[PDB]
């Protein structure tokens, strides 16, 4: 039943501009909400706290030593 119901969903992604001091300046994510739980590629979660006009500030729910630019 997992193969007959398997649609790979379209996912709106975004790059990381800079990480340090407990924040992830995330490029893109035009469809993100203020306070949306984002999830990095390393598995560590995050919250889209500051929705700026040119990036999206993301605090990192966990250790930010697994997050790189890009």
């Amino acid at each position: 039943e997992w193969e007959k119901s398997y649609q790979p969903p379209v996912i709106h992604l975004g790059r990381v501009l800079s990480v340090g001091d407990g924040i992830a300046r995330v490029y893109g994510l035009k469809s993100v909400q203020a306070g949306e739980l984002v999830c990095f590629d390393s598995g560590v979660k995050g919250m889209a706290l500051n929705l700026q006009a040119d990036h999206v500030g993301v605090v990192v729910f966990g250790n930010d030593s697994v997050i790189h630019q890009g």
Partner: protein, 520 residues
């Protein structure tokens, strides 16, 4: 609808930026967000200069996307005012939150308005008797003035304002408006049930006979809402003063929360911070609010604004700015509340402009100044009593110590609303009786009375009555204590007869948690 429909540009907490293609709204005007879960009202605070306003949101911004269309209302935040609002609870945008249908609106007034001018001011000085002894003795409240109840974090300024509501607000004749600015939601529900049970709020079709309008933006609300609920309570009170033309009351709870909400917002507008962490525009925002609470020629607003102090610090700029806007000041202290004194009014810091020999009489004035003199001469000797002891003082100094210890206990008073948790019934003292009582203790007619007879009594009769009661019970003694407990004729059953009387409850099979989680 291409023009006059802007989109959300950026969101920083409770601060939302809208960018327009043409016709930016004026500052202090209300915007509406399209497609949000709750009706989220923005309010323009700045113009950022790239066809971009910088709005304060009156609700949560959780779930705002930077593409959401925002319409303009072309007006400020406008609340339903009139006689139909009497008996309703309103939030910061004028919606009813008491679930009694919509608000019967005579007119729709905005919350941003200019203060009344200099020529519209009234210069009147008549007393307002409240029944408390320290207020009616040392800092009498002006009837149509401004009253600040300072002191913070458990000194009793929210109990004292309920006592002021219970005393003055039913014997007043005019209306009342309670504006809860960032106090507890539980306290608002307690006041709503207590005003329904007392009859100053009625429900049903006889709602118009009530005499109190509630406006609540209580402490669960985001800092956009707490910065504007005082202005909504001001608009509701200013309709009664300006159009109905009659004298009201306006009890604003925790006006520090207005300054604190504007400081939480002004951290994210990118302004440079002032002293200890507040906004730079503290004094002007607090003036633009507090100068609207004024008695004009046509009506009167008698306001009792509780002012929370931060960490019991009167040199903090947020209450020290507020000190200039108040007629009668009632500073509460925790050093007196830790002595068991209630209400914990600091008698040597709480002042008033009504304490003048031309207004309240030279007898009341000289009694109040003598009481302040006795307490201050006591306060000068406090270290000497601390380290050197009571057994080396002068005769006159150890008489003023006893007189000051009697008037400190005598300034305490049981409240009509505090008896829910203290047992002692409240005593509403008249004005001339407490003036005569303090004149008697100042002259020295009650030197030989015990000090605990002065504690928690109304007037000068009840201190001698409590002395007679407490000096009976040091000499009251009964012989064999007249029990007659054993062998009561057909009164006490057996233990198992009383056990069999108990109905037995069943136990419904280990929390039943899966059956009412698969139900939804």
């Amino acid at each position: 609808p291409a023009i006059d429909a802007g989109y959300v540009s950026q969101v920083i907490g409770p601060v939302v930026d809208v960018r327009f293609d043409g016709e930016l709204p004026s500052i202090l005007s209300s915007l509406e967000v399209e497609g949000h879960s709750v009706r989220l009202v923005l309010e323009v605070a700045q113009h950022m200069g790239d066809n971009t306003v910088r709005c304060i949101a009156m609700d949560s911004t959780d779930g705002l996307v930077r593409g959401q269309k925002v319409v303009d209302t072309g007006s400020p935040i406008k609340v339903p005012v009139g006689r139909g609002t009497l008996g309703r609870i309103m939030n910061v945008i004028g919606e009813p939150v008491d679930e009694q249908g919509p608000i019967d609106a005579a007119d729709i007034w905005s919350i941003h308005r200019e203060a009344p001018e200099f020529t519209e001011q009234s210069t009147e000085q008549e007393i307002l008797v409240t029944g408390i002894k320290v207020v009616d003795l040392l800092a009498p409240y002006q009837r149509g003035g401004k009253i600040g109840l300072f002191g913070g974090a458990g000194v009793g300024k929210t109990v004292l304002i309920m006592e002021l509501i219970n005393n003055v607000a039913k014997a007043h004749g005019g209306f009342s408006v309670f504006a809860g600015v960032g106090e507890r939601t539980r306290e608002g529900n307690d006041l709503y049930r207590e005003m329904i049970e007392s009859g100053v709020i009625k429900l049903g079709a006889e709602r118009g006979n009530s005499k109190c309008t509630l406006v609540y933006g209580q402490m669960n609300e985001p800092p956009g809402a707490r910065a504007r609920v005082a202005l909504t309570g001001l608009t509701v009170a200013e309709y009664f003063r300006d159009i109905e033309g009659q004298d009201v009351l306006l009890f604003v709870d925790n006006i520090f929360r207005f300054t604190q909400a504007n400081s939480e917002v002004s951290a994210l507008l990118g302004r440079i911070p002032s002293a200890v962490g507040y906004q730079p525009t503290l004094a002007t925002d607090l003036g633009g609010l507090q100068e609207r609470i004024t008695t004009t020629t046509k009506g009167s607003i008698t306001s009792v604004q509780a002012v929370y102090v931060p960490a019991d610090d009167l040199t903090d700029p947020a209450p020290a700015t507020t000190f200039a806007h108040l007629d009668a000041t009632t500073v509460l202290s925790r050093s007196i509340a830790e002595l068991g004194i209630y209400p914990a009014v600091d008698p040597l810091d709480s002042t008033s402009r009504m304490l003048n020999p031309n207004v309240i009489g030279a007898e009341h004035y000289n009694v109040a100044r003598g009481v302040q003199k006795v307490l201050q001469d006591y306060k000068n000797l406090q270290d000497i009593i601390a380290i050197l002891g009571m057994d080396e003082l002068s005769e006159e100094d150890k008489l003023t110590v006893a007189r000051a210890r009697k008037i400190q206990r005598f300034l305490s008073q049981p409240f009509q609303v505090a008896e829910v948790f203290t047992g002692t019934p409240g005593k509403y003292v008249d004005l001339a009786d407490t003036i005569s009582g303090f004149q008697g203790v100042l002259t020295g007619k009650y030197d030989d009375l015990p000090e605990m007879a002065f504690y928690m009594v109304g007037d000068i009769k009840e201190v001698k009555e409590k002395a007679d009661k407490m000096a009976k019970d040091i000499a009251s003694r009964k012989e064999a204590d007249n029990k007659k407990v054993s062998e009561e004729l057909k009164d006490i059953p057996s233990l198992d007869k009383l056990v069999s009387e108990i109905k037995e409850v069943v136990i419904e099979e280990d929390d039943g948690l899966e059956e009412d989680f698969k139900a939804e």
